[PDB]
Design a protein around this ligand. Structure first.
Ligand SMILES: *[C@@H]1O[C@H](CO)[C@@H](O)[C@H](O)[C@H]1NC(C)=O
Lengths: 98, 111, 48
């Protein structure tokens, strides 16, 4: 058996399901089409919530392409938009992916 | 029948998803629905055949999936020339045997 | 029973044979081993 640990932003706990995509189902954890086992979920507002926003948790907004299931994306690198010569620092069409 | 939103817009780079749907009585079991792209002044080309099968010559950023009665496509890593006229074509048994979308015109906010 | 096992309404003298004497049980007893090495699901739901 295997188990994980997440903090999901609100309404996309519904999208955690074997087969359809979403905001965090392409650049983050996605379930395969042959997903045995299931989802153990509960409303834990008691622990992972504090008053002026929790900036200790991170999520990926974009990639080069879609990632395969059961993969971890740990490489942090500045992302350019297609063909713009842009590296080292941020600015126009160069945003951090976190 | 077959319908889709008339237009869609969003931020450049990412965050776009286009869908089609239709009445299940007119729709003959929902097989062999294809996704095309039309350019102004250029010939249209095939992008996706039968929901989630990738032909040769296309990039991996195009993807398509169908749930229930609604089919859709997503594309990641948008560019300055990725504005399109994405159409869905399908089989309709009661009316005219082929149905061709509802019109799309993607626009960007880069300028 | 000694009539129905011979398909006759009259039976002669002598010792016959019938069905066996069966004693049936009452309840069920299941004793698998004491629980041990509980899996650490308690620490992952109570994780900080
Ligand atoms: C956490 O530990 C408590 C005992 O302190 C236990 O009763 C409870 O079942 C555990 N699980 C939870 C709520 O995470």
């Amino acid at each position: 058996v295997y188990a994980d640990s997440f903090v999901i932003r609100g309404d996309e706990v519904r999208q955690i399901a074997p087969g359809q995509t979403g905001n965090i189902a392409d650049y983050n954890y996605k379930l395969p089409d042959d997903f045995t086992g299931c989802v153990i979920a509960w409303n834990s507002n008691k622990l992972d919530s504090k008053v002026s926003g929790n900036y200790n948790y991170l999520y990926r907004l974009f990639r080069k392409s879609n990632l395969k299931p059961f993969e971890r994306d740990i490489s942090t690198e500045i992302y350019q938009a297609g063909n713009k010569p842009c590296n080292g620092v941020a600015g126009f069409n160069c945003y951090f992916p976190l | 029948a077959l319908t889709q939103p008339a237009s869609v817009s969003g931020s450049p780079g990412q965050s776009i998803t286009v869908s089609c749907t239709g009445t299940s009585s007119d729709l003959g079991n929902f097989q062999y629905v294809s996704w095309y792209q039309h350019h102004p002044g250029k010939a249209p080309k095939l992008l996706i055949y039968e929901v989630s099968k990738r032909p040769s010559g296309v990039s991996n950023r195009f993807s398509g999936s169908k749930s229930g009665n609604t089919a859709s496509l997503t594309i990641s890593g948008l560019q300055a020339e990725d504005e399109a006229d994405y159409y869905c074509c399908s089989y309709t048994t009661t009316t005219i045997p082929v149905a061709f979308g509802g019109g799309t015109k993607l626009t960007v906010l880069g300028q | 029973e000694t009539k129905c096992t011979l398909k006759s309404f009259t039976v002669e003298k002598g010792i016959y044979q019938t069905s066996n004497f069966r004693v049936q049980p009452t309840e069920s007893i299941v004793r698998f081993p004491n629980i041990t090495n509980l899996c650490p699901f308690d620490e992952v739901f109570n994780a900080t």
